[PDB]
Ligand binder design. Sequence first.
Ligand SMILES: NCCCNCCCCCC(=O)NO
Ligand SMILES: NCCCNCCCCCC(=O)NO
Ligand SMILES: [K+]
Ligand SMILES: [K+]
Ligand SMILES: [N+]
Ligand SMILES: [N+]
Ligand SMILES: [Zn+2]
Ligand SMILES: [Zn+2]
Lengths: 341, 341
Amino acid sequence: MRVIFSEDHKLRNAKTELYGGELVPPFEAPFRAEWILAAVKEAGFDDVVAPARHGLETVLKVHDAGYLNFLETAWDRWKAAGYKGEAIATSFPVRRTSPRIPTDIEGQIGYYCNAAETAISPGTWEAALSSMASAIDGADLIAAGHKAAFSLCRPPGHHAGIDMFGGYCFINNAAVAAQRLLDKGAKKIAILDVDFHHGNGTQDIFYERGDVFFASLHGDPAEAFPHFLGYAEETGKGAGAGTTANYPMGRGTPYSVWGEALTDSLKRIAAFGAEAIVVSLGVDTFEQDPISFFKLTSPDYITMGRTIAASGVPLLVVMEGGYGVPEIGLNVANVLKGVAG
Amino acid sequence: MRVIFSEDHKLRNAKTELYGGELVPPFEAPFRAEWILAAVKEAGFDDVVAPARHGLETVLKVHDAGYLNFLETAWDRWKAAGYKGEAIATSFPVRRTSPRIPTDIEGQIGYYCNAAETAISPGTWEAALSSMASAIDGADLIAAGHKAAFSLCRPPGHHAGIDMFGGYCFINNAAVAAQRLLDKGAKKIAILDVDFHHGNGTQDIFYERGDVFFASLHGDPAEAFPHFLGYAEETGKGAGAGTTANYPMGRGTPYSVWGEALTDSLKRIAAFGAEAIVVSLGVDTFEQDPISFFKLTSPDYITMGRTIAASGVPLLVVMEGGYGVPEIGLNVANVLKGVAG
Ligand SMILES: NCCCNCCCCCC(=O)NO
Ligand SMILES: NCCCNCCCCCC(=O)NO
Ligand SMILES: [K+]
Ligand SMILES: [K+]
Ligand SMILES: [N+]
Ligand SMILES: [N+]
Ligand SMILES: [Zn+2]
Ligand SMILES: [Zn+2]
């Protein structure tokens, strides 16, 4: 099983994250990619290749052009405005605001952000483009006939919506991969988001689209980030009617419960007729994850990968979250073992 | 004229404000009230009295009850959740989010916030209630027949909307005062917001109401906080049709230009038939203000107060912003000299 990974993830090495009212070093840090890469190699997945670079063709079909233009120059503009910290939004277009886009950097960073814990730092845009490239090359392997591949994306993607960054995410890698599979000839694709957090960005991108089914298992947004999307009642609008499926779950959820939601999501995906599944894999569902409240064990990730692959359709696994301990690597490698076994 | 002021403002003494990606000492600090009080006394306004306390009768008519309940316990809940810094929102209900209210403190602080530079700290709620009380007692003096009074509010109020805090504000003191005047028998009231920043909170509270005319002169929101309201096209909705008037202005605006907008706003207020005007007075229009881009001089504040009082209707002056230098006091005192002269 080929692993696509760019060393350019390291260009995002942000100094700060707003957490508990303090500016602390970020949870989503380069050591994550080091730990995951080492563990997948240790598990025998040593066919590791860098992605080819890609321009914006595919990503323009899932993200707004203004948003992408904003990300490309955000750091330069923040620095030119004289601010001394990293680029962190403060004002947001919340209830009953104007829809207009501000012109200056402080207004625009808020316009284009859903979550202020995520700072833009020098190298962020380049890192995000490299992470997108890993997702695109992974998709191309699936399009060309492989039944499994792993895109070791960093930074992650699933909180990036049509025109907003947040939750450590800038470009929605999984969305780009799904779009790439459609562009290569698929008519129906599913994204299955097993990260602890709701993929609100992914949901947003496809909410009014019927070509990509979106399923997410996650901490209940009533008491988990991203807080403002991910309820079970959200099933899609217009052309997207019936193609969003959210499975919010509570504190302490173990695999015996979580796996029942996985089974149901896979039934939904099969009834939709997905030609391939892009798996948004976060391992922050782990019982020792520092920011999450599920209780999956390391062996459960093998079961998970096996069950998803038993769909009998090709899988692209795209890396999302999972923090704090190097066992994030074991957990990811275990999903791949379940897929490959 | 009487000056209403509570020493309980000092219960808000937050340690941090997110500015330029750093946590810095807040601009809206207790020493402001000290500077202002000393200067007004120096100018001969020494009839200074503490407000009587007030319950929530008036404020419940302009703010949402869930919002007020949230503010009352926000600090305690944040601390109980184990966070080490002051209480600062990071996730926000922005474009295309669920309207649902989260249950936990992190979700709720974002739900009820429009701007993350403002941290909730111990004593914030009590301070905000004392500031509201100063506004209510000021309104009561006007209702009883005084032609002018000054409510030395701190914390300020004009960024607090129906159900959101931000911009250093928690309870919209000016909105509470206007409501109090209606409750005491007025049928039409105006709020005139001359602080540099758009009073988006005030606008929100009255946008669909026809009993309170709202006029604001301010830095253009395309390039100034609050960024997402304050455009000239916003003239009201429903019962509030035609009773919001915004005058956005650009960098370097001096009194020769700003005063023309003031004249127009007073024309609008007179045609509406306001029985009294609540003046949201920020002196962050000053040429030295550290966070603002207008160029008013200290003598211009006398002109401003005279012009507003030449409306010939009673005024309640309610303190908003103005930062950095002790001359904030001279500037406030000069508005009062213009009113009283
Ligand atoms: N108790 C608060 C935990 C941190 N809250 C915001 C972090 C964003 C997490 C994004 C992520 O990992 N997404 O997959
Ligand atoms: N360049 C950033 C300067 C600070 N930006 C937002 C501060 C909030 C000001 C609120 C205020 O003073 N309202 O009257
Ligand atoms: K998820
Ligand atoms: K104003
Ligand atoms: N969808
Ligand atoms: N209004
Ligand atoms: Zn996650
Ligand atoms: Zn101001």
